[PDB]
């Protein structure tokens, strides 16, 4: 797991953004976060998977915050439904529901886990702050 | 230049040329090319000789070589030889039958001139002549399994032999039939698919009751084709317990009983027929069978022959007990 985790994190983040479809980049980040959340929320996985999945979470959400901070920048030259298409507000909540689940499970002992999710929490919320003027569905998202 | 001279001439006494070619090849470590050239030749009375020569040359081509393609070609040449042989024997037969049939000669020439396909052969040589033995051989080789067809073919062989044997004395007919059956069985002995034991036995016994022949004939024939005595006994017992009313209708149930008795007596006189390690159990089985037979004989109205048979069976029982 450690090996896997480090490999994935390093390589994925180290890529110099050569992938042309950003939708596919966000789709990849989507499936990765789903499978990850599914495995960690099990009751038969003791603290062994507590920090190593925590380390992976803190990294993938940090790249996602930069991915959506990029989404608020890149207009559609390649009919105004191509920016939030692959994002998914339901996936933004499903990720949130899985994240709140892992914070509940994490006891006070696993501070490192709570530390990697709290930082993963805010990076999800720097997505919700308005740099430019999404408009109303973003407002209800905080609600 | 010998090699290309040969090849060119063979392409343009082609048989001679290709024979020389293959010989030179084998000497010069090129038997594969020898084979290929020979097969090409084969494909390309005189045709009868061509076939004999083709066979010889392909045998020379693959002495041990198991090359799938070439080996299968040699097997096909042996099956082509099968065709030739069956055709000629049966042609002799039907020729002498239809006032030296001219059509038989024509058909034989056709069969030797070219290699035929299963369907054609079957259809054609069935309607004018009905070559059941040949059809059976053909299906055996291909692997086609049709029990009904096999049985029909066997029946037809027997019937044709009988039609041809009507002229001969009963004894001669019987002997000829025996020989033919034995030979054909030895060919398909290993394959039970192409040798329907129950049907054959039943039909032959029916024919015996119809023509009034010897009771032990079938038993002797089956012992001769290495049919185990336990197995034959089993078959007979099964036929008996089936209560076929055919026997009752032919006024001969006692005849079948006596045939069973003859089989059993033959076993007792020479116990070596059964393997040594199975002797005791077989003796116990015979003792049980004898008991049941005796019980049925005693449920029937008495007659002098019946009483004699009962006494014989009791003696057999005593002897078997002494043996065990």
């Amino acid at each position: 797991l450690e090996s896997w985790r480090q490999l994935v994190e390093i390589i994925l983040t180290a890529c110099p953004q050569d992938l042309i479809p950003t939708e596919h980049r966000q789709l990849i980040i989507r499936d990765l976060l789903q499978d990850l959340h599914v495995k960690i929320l099990d009751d038969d996985a003791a603290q062994e998977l507590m920090p190593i999945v925590a380390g992976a979470v803190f990294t993938l959400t940090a790249h996602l915050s930069q991915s959506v901070r990029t989404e608020l920048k890149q207009p559609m030259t390649a009919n105004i439904s191509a920016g939030f298409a692959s994002i998914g507000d339901s996936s933004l909540h499903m990720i949130l529901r899985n994240l709140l689940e892992f914070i509940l499970k994490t006891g006070g002992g696993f501070q490192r886990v709570r530390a990697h999710l709290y930082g993963s929490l805010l990076y999800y919320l720097q997505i919700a702050q308005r740099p430019d003027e999404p408009e109303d569905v973003f407002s209800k998202l905080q609600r | 230049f010998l090699e290309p001279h040969l090849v060119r001439m063979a392409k343009l006494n082609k048989v001679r040329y290709m024979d020389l070619l293959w010989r030179y090849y084998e000497k010069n470590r090129n038997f594969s090319n020898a084979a290929r050239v020979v097969a090409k030749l084969a494909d390309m009375k005189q045709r009868l000789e061509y076939i004999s020569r083709a066979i010889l040359s392909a045998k020379s081509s693959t002495t041990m070589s198991t090359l799938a393609a070439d080996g299968e070609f040699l097997h096909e040449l042996e099956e082509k030889l099968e065709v030739a042989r069956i055709q000629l024997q049966i042609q002799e037969t039907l020729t002498r039958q239809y006032s030296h049939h001219s059509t038989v000669g024509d058909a034989v020439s056709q069969l030797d001139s070219q290699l035929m396909d299963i369907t054609k052969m079957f259809g054609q040589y069935a309607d004018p002549f009905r070559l059941s033995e040949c059809k059976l051989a053909i299906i055996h080789c291909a692997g086609h399994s049709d029990p009904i067809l096999v049985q029909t073919l066997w029946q037809d062989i027997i019937d044709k032999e009988l039609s041809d044997s009507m002229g001969n004395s009963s004894v001669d007919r019987m002997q000829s039939l025996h020989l033919k059956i034995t030979s054909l069985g030895k060919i398909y002995a290993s394959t039970p698919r192409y040798f329907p034991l129950e049907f054959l036995v039943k039909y032959l016994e029916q024919q015996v009751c119809n023509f009034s022949w010897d009771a032990g004939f079938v038993t002797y024939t089956m012992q001769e084709i290495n049919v185990p005595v336990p197995k034959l006994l089993e078959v007979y017992d099964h036929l008996f317990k089936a209560r076929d009313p055919w026997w009752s209708r032919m006024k001969k149930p006692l005849h079948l009983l006596e045939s069973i008795y003859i089989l059993l007596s033959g076993y007792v006189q020479e116990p070596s027929k059964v393997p040594s390690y199975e002797r005791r159990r077989f003796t116990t089985l015979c003792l049980d069978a004898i008991s049941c037979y005796l019980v049925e004989l005693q449920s029937m109205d008495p007659a002098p022959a019946l009483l004699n048979t009962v006494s014989n069976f009791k003696s057999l029982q005593a002897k078997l007990e002494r043996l065990s």
Partner: protein, 233 residues
């Protein structure tokens, strides 16, 4: 006895000096080692097995300690010149003897579906960890750093053929299957990091294109996700 000698440290320098004193002595002894690894008969293969183990454990321990040490003489490296400037070549090419490099390359190359598998079944490396460490130390100590990776990439295409197998199904020891992926992940990681630090696009493209494009070409789960599902918790 050879493995017991290796227990202490500075003797490596004296051992190499002995082996390489005479040209006939350096060759025969080194290539004698090689042919011995190119493995009644039940105890012959067993002894052929334990021989391989004692020889591979010897190569590891001697490697971590010192350079140039015994490992440098055995692995076709030149000692008269600094280890960083060796030109490794294929077995036989330009009079190059089939070395302990070319030997282990042959070992892994044969699609190890063999019953033996990696000898690490009860022990250490799957003999990929050794290669992946010699390749690793080459880069770390800058000794033939380029040559090791360059060779593996151009002559054998070792990682692309090895990483395609994805999850190794050794249920005999899920400890072994997990370790085989462990020592293989730490290597593909440093490989793609350094290739990308250079400018090789064609190589980098093909590699990352395969690992990620789960989309069925000529729902299939990603190769990276199938690994994760093979790790029961």
């Amino acid at each position: 006895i050879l493995c017991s000698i290796s227990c202490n440290s500075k003797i490596q320098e004296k051992i190499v000096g002995d082996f390489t004193q005479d040209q006939n002595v350096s060759q025969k002894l080194m290539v004698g080692f090689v042919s011995c690894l190119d493995s009644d008969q039940v105890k012959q293969t067993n002894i052929r097995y334990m021989t391989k183990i004692h020889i591979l454990n010897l190569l590891i321990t001697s490697l971590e300690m010192k350079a140039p040490n015994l490992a440098m003489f055995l692995l076709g490296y030149e000692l008269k010149k600094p280890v960083s400037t060796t030109n490794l070549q294929d077995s036989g090419v330009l009079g190059c003897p089939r070395t302990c490099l070319h030997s282990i390359l042959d070992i892994l190359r044969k699609g190890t579906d063999v019953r033996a598998g990696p000898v690490a079944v009860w022990d250490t490396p799957h003999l990929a960890e050794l290669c992946y460490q010699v390749i690793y130390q080459l880069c770390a100590c800058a000794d033939t750093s380029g040559p090791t990776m360059r060779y593996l990439r151009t002559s054998q295409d070792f990682l692309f053929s090895q990483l395609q197998h994805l999850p190794f199904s050794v249920e005999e020891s899920e400890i072994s299957a997990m370790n085989q992926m462990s020592w293989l992940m730490k290597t593909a990681t440093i490989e793609l990091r350094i290739t990308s630090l250079n400018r090789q696009r064609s190589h980098t493209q093909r590699l990352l294109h395969l690992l990620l494009d789960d989309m069925p070409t000529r729902k299939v789960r990603r190769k990276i996700l199938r690994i994760l599902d093979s790790i029961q918790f």
